[PDB]
Amino acid sequence: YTRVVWCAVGPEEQKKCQQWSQQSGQNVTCATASTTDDCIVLVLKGEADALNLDGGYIYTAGKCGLVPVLAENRKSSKHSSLDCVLRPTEGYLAVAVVKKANEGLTWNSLKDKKSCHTAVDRTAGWNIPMGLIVNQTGSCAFDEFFSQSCAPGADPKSRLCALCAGDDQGLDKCVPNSKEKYYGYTGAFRCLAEDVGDVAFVKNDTVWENTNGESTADWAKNLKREDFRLLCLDGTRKPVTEAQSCHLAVAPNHAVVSRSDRAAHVEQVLLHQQALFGKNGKNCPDKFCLFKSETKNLLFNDNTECLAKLGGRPTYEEYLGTEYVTAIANLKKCSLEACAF
Ligand SMILES: *[C@@H]1O[C@H](CO)[C@@H](O[C@@H]2O[C@H](CO)[C@@H](O)[C@H](O)[C@H]2NC(C)=O)[C@H](O)[C@H]1NC(C)=O
Ligand SMILES: *[C@@H]1O[C@H](CO)[C@@H](O[C@@H]2O[C@H](CO)[C@@H](O)[C@H](O)[C@H]2NC(C)=O)[C@H](O)[C@H]1NC(C)=O
Ligand SMILES: *[C@@H]1O[C@H](CO)[C@@H](O)[C@H](O)[C@H]1NC(C)=O
Ligand SMILES: O=C(O)c1cccnc1
Ligand SMILES: [Fe+3]
Ligand SMILES: [Zn+2]
Ligand SMILES: [Zn+2]
């Protein structure tokens, strides 16, 4: 009733969800699925209520009638006066990252190189870079641009999955969930940090969070920021300190979605859950922290300060913006208005 069913994607989000379920005294329970698309289907069936999504899936969900409820809000130096829950969202920077030692690699010489993407259909990892590449080449053959890639969610037998590693045992190669070693923001950056790929399409925050001792994870321990470079659209290469002038786009924040008819209820519960397990929540450091999972971004990104109210009660189109929606529509015509399920 005043109980919310959260949809976890894959085994590790299920485990985190179970812990949250427990700490909340079953005010939140869990449903699990193998992909984000399957979780979207559970919400449409009404077998789950909500999940936090990247812009690209918000577009998929919105076509099926799901609505944005609350958005991830990370720290800012502006609007700082305002409380986090009421502060507008800023969006994140979609960037292309390479190793400095890979000299002479620029945006213009990416053809036939190796790439690392968060997952097919995601904003920074797929939609922005591939929409840009389709536009620039006048061709929908994006499956042929890079020699090899790790792009979770593509055909395991295709070259877009050739660089993906699967789990500890080699199983689940290219699945779009955290079982795949190179999945998500962190996995895609690891793919580049390990020299599996020549380039990684992540967001600006990911580089900072997994370099200069910020991570402590074995593959990221010795990663230094000066050993990386951002690729700008003008054919240039800049330090990772210069993302405000060298990004592929600014992305709408990840946001919680639910069926429109369940939105008010999901919103109410979430604001209380975060009062309890949020950044300075009553129980977070001590019993459980919703926005922590050791650099793994499970359920929510680890850099989330809070989930923010939206204001202007936006539809999913208003939320994503006409810029981003037209870019997705244009790219999606390579792979006609309806819910994809
Ligand atoms: C790819 O090219 C298309 C087509 O020019 C670009 O998309 C359009 O986007 C602008 C800005 O939103 C709109 O004014 C046009 O209406 C859109 N054109 C079409 C065909 O819909 C698209 O933005 C470019 N993609 C990228 C990543 O820059
Ligand atoms: C890109 O990401 C990094 C990490 O989120 C941002 O760097 C932080 O900048 C904020 C100020 O906006 C500081 O409070 C943090 O201490 C910085 N993080 C670290 C670990 O150094 C950076 O601002 C972002 N760059 C751009 C252009 O948005
Ligand atoms: C569960 O929900 C009820 C009603 O809002 C509230 O009184 C209680 O504090 C919540 N318990 C937890 C642990 O979230
Ligand atoms: O359509 C919108 O709401 C929009 C478009 C571009 C930038 N910001 C918002
Ligand atoms: Fe994202
Ligand atoms: Zn810009
Ligand atoms: Zn509106």
Kindly state whether residues 104 and 140 are assigned to the same domain: yes
Resolution in A: 2.4
Domain span at residue 147 reads 74-254+317-327
CA of 243 to the centre of ligand 6 (A): 9
Q: Name the H helices within the chain.
A: 11-23, 36-45, 55-63, 128-137, 184-193, 204-209, 263-277, 316-320, 322-332
Residue 86 counted as domain residue: yes
Answer yes or no: is 333 within a domain.
Answer: no
Same domain, 151 and 292: no
CATH of the domain at 128: 3.40.190.10
Question: How far, in Å, is the centroid of ligand 6 from the Cα of 94?
Answer: 9
Nearest Cα residue to 167 out of 156, 177, 157, 180: 180
Task: For residues 145 and 220, state if they share a domain.
Answer: yes
Nearest to 180 by CA among 194, 193, 166, 162: 166
State whether 152 and 241 are in the same domain. yes
- 147, 11: one domain: no
Tokens coding 32: 């699990």
Residue 92 labeled ligand binder: yes
153 and 198 fall within a common domain: yes
Whether residues 218 and 97 share a domain: the answer is yes
Pick the residue whose CA is nearest to atom 1 on ligand 1.
135
Identify the nearest ligand to the CA of 129 by its number. 1
What six digits make up the tokens of 170?
A: 């080699």
Structure tokens at 162: 């050739």
Same domain for 121 and 140? yes
> Residue 30: inside a domain, yes or no?
yes
Q: Tell me, what amino acid is at 314? A: P
Q: Which residues are CB-neighbours of 249 under 8 A, at least 6 positions away?
A: 93, 94, 124, 128, 324
Q: How far apart are CA 3 and CA 12, in angstroms?
A: 22
Beta strands in the chain (DSSP E): 4-9, 28-33, 50-53, 66-73, 92-99, 114-117, 148-150, 199-203, 228-231, 237-238, 249-251, 255-259, 306-308
Residues 298 and 323 in one domain: no
Residue 121's identity, in one-letter code, is D
CB of 75 closer than 8 Å to CB of 308: no
Compute the distance from residue 270 Cα to the ligand 4 centre, in Å: 26
87 has binding-site annotation = no
Residues 85 and 133 in one domain: yes
CA distance 27 to 205: 32
Distance CA 292, CA 285 (A): 10
For residue 191, tell me if it sits in a domain.
yes
Same structural domain, 260 and 200: no
Q: How far apart are the first and last CA of the chain?
A: 27
Q: Is 122 annotated as a binding residue?
A: yes
CA distance 196 to 156: 17
Cβ–ligand 1 contact at 327 (below 6 Å): yes
User: Would you say residue 192 lies in a domain?
Assistant: yes
DSSP for residue 242: G
Q: Could you count the other beta carbons within 10 Å of the beta carbon of residue 307?
A: 26
In three-state secondary structure terms, 164 is: coil
266 located within any domain: yes
Looking at the 3D structure of the chain, how many domains does it have?
A: 2
Q: Identify whether the C-beta of residue 61 lies closer than 8 Å to the C-beta of residue 257.
A: yes
Asked if residue 56 and residue 120 are part of one domain, the reply reads: no
Chain breaks in the chain (C to N over 2.5 A) after: 335
Residue 214 lies inside a defined structural domain of this protein:
yes
Q: Distance (Å, rounded) from C-alpha 284 to C-alpha 274?
A: 9
* Spatial CA neighbour of 188 closest among 246, 125, 104: 125
**Is 332 within the bounds of a domain?**
no
Closest alpha carbon to 148 in 173, 114, 119, 198: 114
Antiparallel, parallel or unpaired: β 114-117 and 148-150: parallel
